[PDB]
Design a protein around this nucleic acid. Structure first.
Ligand code: MG
Ligand code: MG
Ligand code: MG
Ligand code: MG
Ligand code: MG
Ligand code: MG
Ligand code: MG
Ligand code: MG
Length: 224
RNA sequence: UUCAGACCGGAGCAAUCCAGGUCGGUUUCUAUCUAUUAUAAAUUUCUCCCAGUACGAAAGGACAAGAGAAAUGGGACCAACCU
């Protein structure tokens, strides 16, 4: 059995603006020129990575970092992702540019999908979830063609949290809300819900034409 | 401060009073007329040097020239970040 679904790195998806499509073919040709030197592996928010940077100021030019991918955003050449880790008890985040020429090797130790598409809420979660072993070895993939969905509820510090996570606009399934909240506050949070949004139709973003076109563009670019 | 209430010194037999303190106390306008409603052509630090040299018995110790960084003020703009 060969389950086959093509994972397109999220920054090959052009934004909704009215920008002239000529711009996007340029960015694509550049970042696809970049793909051929530095190899960029798949990963998702929740997946654990280790990046090697060229560091001008250190003695060993290589700087090593390891953490969770908390969120990604961008498009074209300006793609970025954010790593999070606790070193010695200090919470540390880094923002990396995917296509930046300073980055030498990216390495995936654990490929994983956690329930929410961004976790900034690991800021208010207890220190365990942000801690990782600097030296852990890459734990490989069995080619199940199923990226494992780890459903893990989290514990949080007492309020306030850097954002209000209980409220509907965030759609957080990952947080454990029974232990961290009271019924009153769970009714409060329901006053900000906007039920009609999922049914808004016109607010929906259509892709697939573009998907076919640019995927064909990537095939065509690998061939040559 | 500056009215109406109120205490506390004091002054008056009192009513009341002292540019003496203290607490409290309504801030109204829908613009008729005149006036007016975006051109540009930078300013300042602090470093780095020079040169620890010129200057003085030593102790302390420069400008000028030349490379950098900022900050503020003009004019803009969202690839990223952040809202
Ligand atoms: Mg905050
Ligand atoms: Mg009296
Ligand atoms: Mg009052
Ligand atoms: Mg008063
Ligand atoms: Mg007034
Ligand atoms: Mg008029
Ligand atoms: Mg008016
Ligand atoms: Mg400015």
């Amino acid at each position: 059995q060969r389950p086959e679904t093509r994972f397109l790195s999220p920054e090959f998806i052009p934004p909704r603006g009215r920008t002239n499509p000529l711009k996007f073919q340029i960015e694509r040709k550049d970042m696809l020129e970049r793909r051929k030197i530095l190899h960029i592996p798949e990963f998702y928010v929740g997946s654990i990575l280790r990046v090697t940077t060229a560091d001008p100021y250190a003695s060993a030019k290589t700087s090593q970092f390891l953490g969770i991918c908390i969120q990604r955003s961008g498009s074209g050449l300006g793609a970025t992702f954010i790593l999070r880790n606790t070193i010695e008890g200090q919470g540390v985040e880094i923002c990396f540019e995917l296509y930046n020429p300073r980055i030498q090797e990216i390495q995936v130790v654990k490929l994983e999908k956690r329930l929410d598409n961004s976790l900034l809420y690991l800021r208010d979660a207890l220190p365990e979830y942000s801690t990782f072993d600097v030296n852990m070895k890459p734990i490989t993939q069995e080619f199940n063609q199923e990226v494992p969905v780890n459903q893990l509820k989290v514990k949080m510090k007492p309020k306030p949290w850097s954002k209000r996570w209980e409220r509907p606009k965030f759609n957080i399934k990952g947080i454990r809300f029974d232990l961290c909240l009271t019924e009153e506050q769970m009714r409060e949070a329901q006053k900000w819900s906007q039920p009609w949004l999922e049914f808004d139709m016109m607010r929906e973003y259509d892709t697939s034409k573009i998907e076919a076109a640019i995927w064909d563009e990537i095939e065509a670019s690998k061939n040559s």
